[PDB]
């Protein structure tokens with residue numbers, strides 16, 4: 420678990436992200452798609468995007484970025500007591516979308532990267548460490564649900 424101090428660093432920087440959900444959202448998905456091309460193949464919706472320019476220019480990709488971050492934010496703000504917000508997500512990602520846990524790890528690295536570029540002042544080592552732990556907690560609980568369903 421994260422301490423009250425670690426959660427503070429996480430939510431303090433996440434408030435900065437909420438000031439521009441769409442901008443952070445498009446950057447994170449683009450980072451994910453460029454860094455790990457195999458994640459892009461999972462999305463029938465964005466499978467056609469070949470260049471980075473095409474990705475930045477897509478309104479639907481940007482719309483999905485909002486959906487991912489808002490859903491992540493609801494989880495983060497629960498500070499661990501996110502069972503009700505996490506279960507539905509794991510169920511659909513395991514059985515419907517078929518997202519392996521490794522991809523959730525890839526998107527966590529993409530999130531940490533984007534937060535560093537956009538908010539260097541409020542995302543130093545300490546804050547980066549806290550966010551990493553919160554994203555691990557996220558993956559840990561999802562994996563436990565995946566195992567239960569038989570997707571581990």
Ligand code: HEM
Nearest residue numbers: 458461462464486487490491507508511516518522523526
């Ligand atoms: C930060 C982690 C993530 C969060 C919070 C998240 C959240 C969501 C949400 C809220 C939806 C829409 C409702 C639903 O089906 O649950 C969704 C859909 C989807 N997600 Fe994720 N997701 C995450 C990571 C990923 C990753 C890593 C992949 C693929 C590699 C992925 C692939 C998909 C796909 C394919 C859909 C269906 C899109 C469509 O056709 O509308 N997600 N996700």
